[PDB]
Amino acid sequence: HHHHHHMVHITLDRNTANSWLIISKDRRQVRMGDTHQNVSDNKERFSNYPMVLGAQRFSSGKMYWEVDVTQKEAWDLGVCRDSVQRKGQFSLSPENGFWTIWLWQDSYEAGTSPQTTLHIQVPPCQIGIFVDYEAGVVSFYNITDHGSLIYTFSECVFAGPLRPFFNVGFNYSGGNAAPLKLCPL
């Protein structure tokens, strides 16, 4: 892929974060805390899951960014509509405004409804995410494996501004404490 030149500088939006997340000073890393992080509640925070949005909103053009997932056991990554539900239980699906992939229990799946099995021979340590707003495409790339394609959502119906989407996952096992990190350009 030659998507690298559409690179965008993504930063995390503290105000959207689940109250247990710890976002770094530079707003480029996020991890699960072992407790509530002493913030006030607001209508933007994801209540049920360890999720956070990027600050950037996209309504046109081509955008690319990379995320480091080294040594995590569980995470979700992609892009979502600015108006996705924040409170209560929901599934990650295009019907609910999400275009995502995940790792869970040693398998990778795309957030279609129902979910789609991914075929990854080289477990990724960094994921590339490409959005073509006009074409209705969201693609995922395995940076560890020379940028090989992981998955393409096509015929996307965004139906609003898009935001970068992140889930660091729970840490019930004690093996999923590592952060998500936005990689430098």
Ligand SMILES: COc1ccccc1-c1nnco1
């Ligand atoms: C089955 O997909 C959808 C259902 C509902 C709304 C959007 C989609 C979609 N987006 N990109 C591809 O599909």
